[PDB]
Structure formats: C-alpha cells, structure tokens
C-alpha cells in the first residue's frame, strides 16, 4: 500500500493521473495538492511516501527539495529541471536513502522508440524523423525528436528537407486531430525500417507514471530516465 499525493492536482496531467489511479490497487491517492496548497504539511498529514509533480518549470526543483525534505519521494514528470539541480537532487535522495525519479517523458512507447531508434542507428546511418503533435504544440521540433536525433547521432559519432539536429532531419507535423506522434525512418539499399509512436491521450504516460510510484519505493537515488526503470 503506497500512499500518493499528486501535486498539479487541477492541471491536464495531474487530473488524469487522478482517473486512472483509482484503478491501482496497490496505490492510494491520500490527497491532491495544487498552488496554494502547502506541500510539506499534507506530506506530514497523509503520511506519503511518494508525490508525482506535474506542476511548473517555475516551482519544479523547489516541489522537489521540498518532498525529499519532508522525507517523501518525488515522481517528478515536469520539464524544467537543470544539468546542476538534478546532480544536487541525486546527492540528497542518497544522503537521505530516498528514492527519486525525474523523467522528461513518462510514455513507455515513447521511451522504447527512442532506445530502439538509437540501437538501429548502429546499422542504418541514414535517418529521418517525423514528428506530428495537435497545433497546441508550439514548439517545434518537440523536445522528444530533439533528444531522439541527439541519441542517434552520439551512436552514429561513436527548406523542405526539414531542420537538422545533431546531423538528423527533423520534420514537425501541427494538425488537428493529433496528439503526439512519432516516425523514425531509417533507409538503406532495398528497404526501410520504420519505428513508430503514437500517443493517442495523456493516458500514454500512466504506465510510466504508476511503474515509477512502485520502483520509486525500493531506490535510494535518483533515476533520470524512464528508459532507466525499464
Ligand atoms: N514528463 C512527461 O511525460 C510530461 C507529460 C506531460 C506534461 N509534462 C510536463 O508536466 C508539467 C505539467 O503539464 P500540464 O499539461 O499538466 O500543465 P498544466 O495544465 O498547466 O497544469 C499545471 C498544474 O500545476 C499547478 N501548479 C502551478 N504551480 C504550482 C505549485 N507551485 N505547486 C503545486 N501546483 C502548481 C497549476 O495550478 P493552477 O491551475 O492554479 O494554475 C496547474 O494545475 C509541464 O511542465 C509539462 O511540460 C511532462
Ligand atoms: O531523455 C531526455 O532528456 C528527453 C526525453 C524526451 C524529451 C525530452 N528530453
Ligand atoms: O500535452 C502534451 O503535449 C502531451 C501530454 C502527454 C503526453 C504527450 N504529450
């Protein structure tokens, strides 16, 4: 029985973490915190051992500091986090024999398209990648095909024809009717090999989410990465 606050409770992620959790058995959501909220005295109320943020790149290391202050473990899935504040996390949780885990992207199928992307790059130098997300992405590329080309490109290393990263083009798709999409297409003489994600709702993440609640309890550092838990 592992005692959960969900901290963002009000924002898109947090309130469908809110559904789906009902559904685990072996998690009990004992409370939802947002802004205003004061974190360390609900984590003190409830007694809870670990704390998803879903939150702000704003307030994200401070909500950190605070769970692991209070002797709760975070579950953090807010972007933001710098190189410095992650390494400063890691030497707390391992001071205080806590676990954490910081994940940039908690979709399992996301994160398994880009390890077997990086793994195809050793055979394939030839590759492309299509990314696709409804018009509410503003970014582009999205976070995700930038790290993707950067992993293809360490393992290589070791205006239509779209925007290059770390030597890999990157084409960005914004329509309507789409969430978060993404094709990975490596070609050679006679074939291509094509690995595919397609985050149909925010849903895609609660796999990675719920994992991390349950492996958070038997760490005591830090994990970056959901690849990492895998
Ligand atoms: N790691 C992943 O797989 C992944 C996936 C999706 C999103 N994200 C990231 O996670 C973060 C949340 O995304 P979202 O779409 O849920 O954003 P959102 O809809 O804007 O929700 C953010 C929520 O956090 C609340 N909040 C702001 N400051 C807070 C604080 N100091 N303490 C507690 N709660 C606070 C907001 O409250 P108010 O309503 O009062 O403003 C809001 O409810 C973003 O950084 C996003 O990029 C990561
Ligand atoms: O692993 C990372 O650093 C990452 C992953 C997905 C999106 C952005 N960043
Ligand atoms: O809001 C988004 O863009 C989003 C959310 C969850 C998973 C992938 N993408």
Redesign the pocket.
């Given at each position: 029985a592992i005692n959960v606050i969900i901290?963002?409770?009000?924002?898109?992620?947090?309130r469908v973490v809110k559904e789906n959790i009902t559904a685990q058995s072996d998690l009990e959501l004992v409370s939802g915190?947002?802004?205003q909220?004061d974190?360390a005295k609900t984590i003190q109320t409830t007694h809870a051992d670990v704390v998803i943020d879903?939150?702000?790149?704003?307030?994200?290391f401070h909500?950190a500091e605070i769970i692991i202050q209070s002797g709760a473990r975070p579950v953090i899935?807010?972007?933001?986090l710098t190189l410095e504040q992650i390494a400063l996390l890691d030497k707390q949780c391992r001071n205080k024999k806590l676990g954490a885990i910081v994940?940039?992207?908690?979709?399992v199928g996301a994160v398994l398209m880009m390890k077997y992307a990086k793994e195809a790059a050793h055979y394939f130098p030839d590759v492309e990648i299509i990314e696709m997300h409804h018009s509410q992405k503003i970014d582009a590329p999205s976070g995700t095909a930038i790290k993707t080309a950067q992993m293809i490109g360490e393992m290589r290393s070791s205006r239509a024809r779209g925007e290059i990263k770390n030597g890999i083009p990157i084409h960005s798709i914004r329509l309507p009717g789409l969430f978060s999409h993404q094709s990975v297409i490596f070609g050679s003489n006679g074939e291509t090999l094509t690995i595919r994600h397609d985050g149909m709702d925010?849903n895609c993440?609660m796999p990675?989410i719920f994992m991390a609640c349950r492996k958070v309890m038997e760490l005591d550092y830090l994990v970056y990465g959901l690849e990492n838990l895998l």
């Open positions: 901290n963002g409770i009000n924002g898109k992620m947090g915190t947002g802004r909220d974190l879903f939150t702000t790149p704003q307030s994200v909500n899935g807010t972007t933001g994940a940039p992207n908690f979709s925010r993440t990675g």
